[PDB]
Amino acid sequence: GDNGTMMQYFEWYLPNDGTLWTKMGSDASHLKSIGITGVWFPPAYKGQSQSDVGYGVYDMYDLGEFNQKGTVRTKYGTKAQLQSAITSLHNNGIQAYGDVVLNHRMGADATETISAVEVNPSNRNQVTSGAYNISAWTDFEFPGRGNTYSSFKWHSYYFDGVDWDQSRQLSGKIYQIQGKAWDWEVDSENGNYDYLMGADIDYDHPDVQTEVKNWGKWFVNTLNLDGVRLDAVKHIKFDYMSSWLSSVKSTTGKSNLFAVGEYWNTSLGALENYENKTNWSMSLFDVPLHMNFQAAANGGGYYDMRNLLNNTMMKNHPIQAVTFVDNHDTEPGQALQSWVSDWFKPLAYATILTRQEGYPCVFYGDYYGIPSQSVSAKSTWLDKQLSARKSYAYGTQHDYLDNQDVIGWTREGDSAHAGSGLATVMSDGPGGSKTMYVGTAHAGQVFKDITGNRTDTVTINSAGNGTFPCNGGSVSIWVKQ
Ligand SMILES: OC[C@H]1O[C@H](OC[C@H]2O[C@H](O[C@H]3[C@H](O)[C@@H](O)[C@@H](O)O[C@@H]3CO)[C@H](O)[C@@H](O)[C@@H]2O)[C@H](O)[C@@H](O)[C@@H]1O
Ligand SMILES: OC[C@H]1O[C@H](O[C@H]2[C@H](O)[C@@H](O)[C@@H](O)O[C@@H]2CO)[C@H](O)[C@@H](O)[C@@H]1O
Ligand SMILES: OC[C@H]1O[C@H](O)[C@H](O)[C@@H](O)[C@@H]1O
Ligand SMILES: OC[C@H]1O[C@H](O)[C@H](O)[C@@H](O)[C@@H]1O
Ligand SMILES: [Ca+2]
Ligand SMILES: [Ca+2]
Ligand SMILES: [Ca+2]
Ligand code: NA
């Protein structure tokens, strides 16, 4: 067993040129050489416009195959182009995880007149008006697809709520459809966080429950997926999501189907809750670790690096942790902007890539850069960290998370991977050394900094210890020369 490494193969500000699937296909053998074992690709189905990033879901049966919303292709390309890309990933032994967006729909084909009440955006449980008629965007007819793959049409009675009355056109409102209840169990911020945006799917209605589990089967079968990435799980009835996932595993026979959910909450408690209510059947993005990386990045050297891993899925539930530094939602100008500055980013990526805890995820925005926000590509130095992970980050780990500035850990090596073993050392502050145990096995061997940040070498004494230096505000990853 080789280490596993995910890559989010998109960012928010990609150009709308229908080329991402093409590119992903080409990149397959390159991704294999740098140690990517799995690729998370963005919502592949038709959004409300050609340029939609994917979260403005229109038709989940249109993988850029049908002419709807004025385009055949999605922002990313055609069903044909996606299938070639997935084949190419598979030919290079890389897993394909599809982004699955179940919370809502938008770009309804027409309005329906329906009775609804206003609820309080701070407390969706509290009603704030009498019933009355609104013009709600709840009619999904799918005219360019007709009945190919599914004749299921969405109407008002399949949604719990909307944020727009077309007849009166008012901001700041959340409408609950008459005789509907916000689903449960959901995140309890705003009393009930079932409603986020668009037309909120009612996961109480059992026609919806069995249609969405069919969609699941069709999606995973049609693209031959190894896994799913689940958008907005905090806003979706936990029991249904737990059964949605075991239904798809069962109906497809992919019973080892990988699943990671976006539960966006800075509190480990909330995440633990979601895991408990879903039988630990899926992993979660380590959002608390991301927040810690940001705090250290903005600490100007004064963050207490001993606390870097506190209150994280990485430390506390490593088998269900998907670790990340930044994503499409945290990048500059997006909704959860919490960017990790350039100087700290290598310390963060060294943390998720050289430690035994977590399934780490490399951001496309980091690897290839974000031109629209003047972010350099980090590919040159990331390649060296990914080399460390692929070929050296193996065997017993020893942790030295024991100073405000300088911290480190070692990996002894396993016999399965030749020459394997490393010592990672990093400082949020001035440069220094740590004496750490890499194993008596390595005695007399000479270590180099695979990052290139330092040109000196460390000789391992016969007790199996080295004294490993790093630069100020940098990281060095030491391996057998
Ligand atoms: O119209 C609704 C909303 O849309 C965007 O929000 C995007 C993100 O919403 C969720 O995250 C919320 C957190 O769960 C709350 O803790 C708090 O921090 O607020 C954010 C949203 O502002 C969701 O879980 C993420 O996947 C979404 O991308 C807009 O930016 C909001 O201003 C709108 O209210
Ligand atoms: O008729 C124009 C356009 O109106 C809507 O766009 C809304 C959106 O739905 C609301 O959720 C909110 O953000 O205000 C926007 C203001 O323009 C419709 O949803 C859309 O289908 C329609 O074409
Ligand atoms: O954390 C487990 C993951 O590790 C690796 O990428 C495997 O290839 C994948 O199947 C597994 O789901
Ligand atoms: O906190 C609000 C919640 O209280 C209870 O748990 C109800 O069962 C649920 O339907 C409601 O929204
Ligand atoms: Ca409901
Ligand atoms: Ca919802
Ligand atoms: Ca410090
Ligand atoms: Na709902």
Side-chain angles (χ1 to χ4, degrees):
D2 292 317
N3 283 319
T5 308
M6 197 193 286
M7 175 148 168
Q8 183 180 353
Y9 207 80
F10 69 108
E11 63 107 349
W12 196 273
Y13 303 110
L14 287 174
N16 175 20
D17 62 13
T19 73
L20 180 65
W21 300 149
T22 287
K23 288 196 207 325
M24 190 164 75
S26 295
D27 214 8
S29 91
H30 167 233
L31 296 177
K32 183 180 68 65
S33 77
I34 71 172
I36 306 298
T37 79
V39 161
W40 152 30
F41 67 80
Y45 25 83
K46 186 67 54 70
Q48 75 193 303
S49 52
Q50 184 194 51
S51 71
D52 202 283
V53 170
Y55 301 100
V57 175
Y58 173 62
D59 179 3
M60 309 194 51
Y61 284 106
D62 184 354
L63 299 186
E65 167 164 27
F66 306 105
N67 184 334
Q68 321 188 91
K69 301 293 129 151
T71 175
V72 168
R73 63 167 194 68
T74 49
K75 174 163 178 218
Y76 300 122
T78 67
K79 186 182 134 185
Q81 294 177 335
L82 183 46
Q83 273 166 329
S84 295
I86 296 175
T87 302
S88 186
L89 287 172
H90 285 157
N91 301 330
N92 294 268
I94 297 174
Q95 305 218 311
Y97 310 148
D99 208 314
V100 167
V101 189
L102 295 185
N103 178 64
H104 57 259
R105 296 297 172 102
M106 326 203 185
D109 295 285
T111 71
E112 295 184 334
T113 311
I114 49 164
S115 199
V117 308
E118 301 176 22
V119 313
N120 173 19
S122 316
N123 186 3
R124 285 80 174 284
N125 286 146
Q126 158 180 337
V127 190
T128 70
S129 83
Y132 69 99
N133 281 8
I134 60 170
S135 200
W137 289 95
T138 64
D139 194 7
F140 297 76
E141 287 310 326
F142 308 126
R145 187 167 46 82
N147 282 352
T148 301
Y149 310 128
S150 163
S151 53
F152 193 106
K153 316 294 174 214
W154 299 71
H155 306 265
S156 64
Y157 50 81
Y158 291 152
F159 302 114
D160 277 321
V162 304
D163 56 12
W164 195 247
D165 178 6
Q166 187 54 71
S167 94
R168 269 181 220 70
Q169 301 202 44
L170 302 164
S171 297
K173 305 292 200 193
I174 304 172
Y175 306 97
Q176 197 170 29
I177 317 279
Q178 189 59 60
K180 295 283 179 142
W182 301 125
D183 307 333
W184 190 261
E185 179 180 359
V186 298
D187 194 76
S188 69
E189 184 185 346
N190 309 121
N192 177 293
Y193 220 159
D194 188 19
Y195 189 81
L196 173 59
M197 59 186 174
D200 187 13
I201 291 167
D202 179 9
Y203 278 107
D204 288 324
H205 197 300
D207 282 349
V208 160
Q209 302 185 36
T210 43
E211 160 54 38
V212 168
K213 295 190 221 209
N214 296 347
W215 174 73
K217 194 195 62 172
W218 175 81
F219 187 59
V220 171
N221 281 331
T222 301
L223 296 177
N224 179 37
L225 300 183
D226 314 299
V228 289
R229 178 273 177 189
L230 300 167
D231 185 60
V233 299
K234 86 194 285 217
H235 311 282
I236 297 164
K237 192 175 167 52
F238 303 163
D239 58 289
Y240 177 70
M241 187 59 78
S242 176
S243 61
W244 177 91
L245 176 56
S246 35
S247 155
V248 173
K249 272 157 149 164
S250 173
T251 45
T252 62
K254 290 280 179 47
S255 62
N256 280 340
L257 196 70
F258 175 74
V260 53
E262 181 222 9
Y263 203 109
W264 194 269
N265 205 291
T266 64
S267 150
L268 183 49
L271 264 56
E272 269 163 352
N273 185 44
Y274 184 82
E275 289 300 79
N276 288 329
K277 305 299 166 63
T278 57
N279 309 314
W280 294 75
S281 64
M282 80 173 76
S283 294
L284 297 175
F285 288 111
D286 197 355
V287 174
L289 181 55
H290 166 72
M291 298 307 304
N292 294 351
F293 291 151
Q294 170 175 241
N298 305 338
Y302 294 109
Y303 185 83
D304 180 5
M305 289 287 284
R306 283 166 316 174
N307 306 340
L308 194 68
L309 305 191
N310 295 351
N311 306 303
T312 64
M313 297 283 299
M314 204 204 201
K315 182 193 212 162
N316 282 100
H317 298 301
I319 299 303
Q320 293 78 40
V322 173
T323 48
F324 76 98
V325 184
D326 268 306
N327 66 26
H328 63 294
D329 284 333
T330 67
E331 77 180 287
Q334 286 312 296
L336 302 176
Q337 169 162 246
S338 44
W339 190 244
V340 176
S341 59
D342 281 10
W343 77 272
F344 193 78
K345 187 141 285 171
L347 280 72
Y349 269 107
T351 296
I352 74 171
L353 287 176
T354 66
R355 285 179 57 89
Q356 80 201 327
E357 298 82 13
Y359 191 14
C361 188
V362 175
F363 188 34
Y364 178 113
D366 282 335
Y367 189 82
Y368 287 128
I370 307 159
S372 86
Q373 314 293 321
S374 326
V375 180
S376 54
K378 312 305 193 328
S379 66
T380 314
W381 62 253
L382 268 171
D383 276 347
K384 305 209 181 75
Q385 291 198 10
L386 288 163
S387 172
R389 178 172 189 76
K390 178 180 165 155
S391 309
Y392 300 87
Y394 292 107
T396 311
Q397 183 169 307
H398 308 283
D399 287 354
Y400 305 71
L401 276 88
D402 71 20
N403 181 237
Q404 274 161 339
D405 285 355
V406 187
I407 68 178
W409 49 84
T410 57
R411 304 285 301 272
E412 279 193 60
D414 67 8
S415 48
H417 300 83
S420 80
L422 60 76
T424 291
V425 59
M426 67 177 55
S427 172
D428 86 307
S433 290
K434 265 209 161 47
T435 304
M436 302 186 285
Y437 175 72
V438 295
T440 57
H442 289 283
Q445 300 185 328
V446 155
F447 276 42
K448 79 198 204 193
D449 181 10
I450 197 174
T451 66
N453 291 328
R454 290 192 63 82
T455 54
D456 53 344
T457 52
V458 174
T459 281
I460 311 295
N461 79 14
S462 47
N465 305 304
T467 291
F468 302 100
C470 64
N471 305 314
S474 189
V475 49
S476 288
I477 302 164
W478 296 95
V479 304
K480 183 200 199 304
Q481 189 162 49

